[PDB]
């Protein structure tokens, strides 16, 4: 019962979105946290509050040149207009001559990708703790008719509390009918996307399969060095499970990694419950997880405010801002 | 390790559904067609989706030593060889190395049909040849426009069923996602008079003929049948046969119920 409010609290935000709520000179460009295109998340020192944040930088020209304008307003409209424990909180957004900027709550834990490769693989219970969180988020998201469409360890951050934060909404979209864009990450694409069938929520769930398989197995289920070959394997759906998988696990996977939509978990009559109620999730306290009254497997090792020990290092370029507005027409809705 | 390399996202140009014909010889067609059918993006398409795409594939012919495509030089173009011979070489550094051959057959660059991916080798024409290109955007469009059309409205169909009026739209869409196809040929039997009724059909084109042993009914495009299969599994009322060349939609019911529950639970709604 509580939930339905979420919806309204969202619709409100969504039609009348926060617009321009700061400018570059209130933060101190500390360190590059990540490169994209274009690109380059920065840890920043906010001058007054001293509060620390992460600011996604976006060169209007690249986006524009890479036919990515829609995806970008999508990212933002959506992302201010939403609210969840495991969704990254957006503090300010604004623009200038050259760039687009989004300031989110800085998640210091680093990437689950980072951890995974380093560590090797996750214990079922360990993976299960993350998985649980993702399940919930997708639930809340689909409730509002939003798909994420870009699940992967590289897009999942850990907070100091050991919990998860979903990170890159560049593909998130509000879809009521059925949408058509071929995007995501090769290793994580649902067959219906590969094949230009048109789709909605089930693609998110397929992704869920892939993620869990990767967490526990320490690698993804569909693999090759040539992308097409990955795709081929995806579209047949047939996948080996590593020797060391609980029976309860291999089962669940078979139900998420279902090419047959009439069979894929998440897309069925009882929708998402077929999942929460699945046996693997037995030990899972969904009410408790929500509130974060569960204890995290792993705690990121953090030192002091604004530590970036958990992130890789890139070579810092300096932010240039043209004397001339660029692509201003295009990003007005921003 | 480089298991530590991140997996970058990929994305094609968009298109929401809400003319182009390059000419070629009867032969030329069959040849290309059977050159593509084994390719992931082509193994699938219904013969007209297939057909609109041969249509869309343009002719490019080349002077010898012409750079058919250059390594690093872009890709939204996939090419199948019609005629000609070809050298392949890649400059990995540094070293510049002939790799392999193409002798009047073969294709390359289909990944370009999904999202942009810069050719990895340079293809040089050894001698006079010609090939068939296909841009990505032109292709996504053909394929999407189609399913979009050849999906909603399948629907005047699904929602033309008196058994299904009480569905909500999303639920109907769920069914559109998965409903399958069957082409039947004149005289080939569709439904048998005694078989475990497991699915309902809708003539996409042609006509079906239901009979009990003397013709009880005849179905044309738009109309359904074997519908009782939704409410009662009991053995087939009658039999269905193909008058001419008929194409039908086919929905196995177990499948159906997994998605929406028992059909009757739905009728009871309102
Ligand atoms: N709030 C944040 N806190 C800390 N690091 C972040 C945050 N947001 C993004 N990053 C870092 O930036 C990287 C890329 O961000 P992302 O939004 O995925 O950009 P893109 O998808 O364009 O590559 C992430 O992998 C992460 O390491
Ligand atoms: Mg990303
Ligand atoms: Mg992105």
Describe the fold and architecture.
The complex is a heterodimer of chains A (334) and B (270). Chain A has helices at 4-15, 60-65, 69-80, 112-119, 124-142, 191-194, 202-217, 227-236, 247-256, 273-276, 286-291; strands spanning 27-34, 41-46, 52-59, 90-95, 99-105, 146-147, 156-158, 164-166, 173-174, 183-184. By secondary structure, chain A is an alpha+beta fold. A five-stranded antiparallel β-sheet of chain A has the order 1-2-3-5-4. In chain A, strands 6-9 form a two-stranded antiparallel sheet. In chain A, β4 and β5 form a beta hairpin. In chain A, α5 packs antiparallel against α7 and α7 (202-217) packs antiparallel against α9 (247-256). Chain B is α+β, with helices and mostly antiparallel strands and 270 residues long. In chain B, 21% of the residues lie in helices and 30% in strands. Chain B contains six helices and 14 strands. In chain B, the strands form three sheets. In chain B, strands 10, 11, 12, 13 and 14 form a five-stranded antiparallel β-sheet that branches. In chain B, strands 2-9-4-7 form a four-stranded antiparallel β-sheet. Chain A binds chain B through residues 67-68, 70-71, 113, 117, 150, 152, 154, 168, 170-171, 177-187, 192, 194-198, 200, 219, 227-228, 231-232, 235, 260-263, 267-269, and chain B through 3-4, 6-17, 40-41, 44, 110-111, 114-115, 117, 140, 143-144, 147-148, 151-152, 173-174, 177-178, 252, 255-261. β10 of chain A pairs antiparallel with β1 (10-11) of chain B. The site of adenosine-5'-diphosphate (ADP) has 18 residues of chain A, from β1, β3 and β5. Chain B: Keywords: cAMP, cAMP-binding, Cell membrane, Cytoplasm, Membrane, Nucleotide-binding, Phosphoprotein, Repeat. Chain B: Belongs to the cAMP-dependent kinase regulatory chain family. Chain B: 3',5'-cyclic AMP 2 binds at residues 163-270.
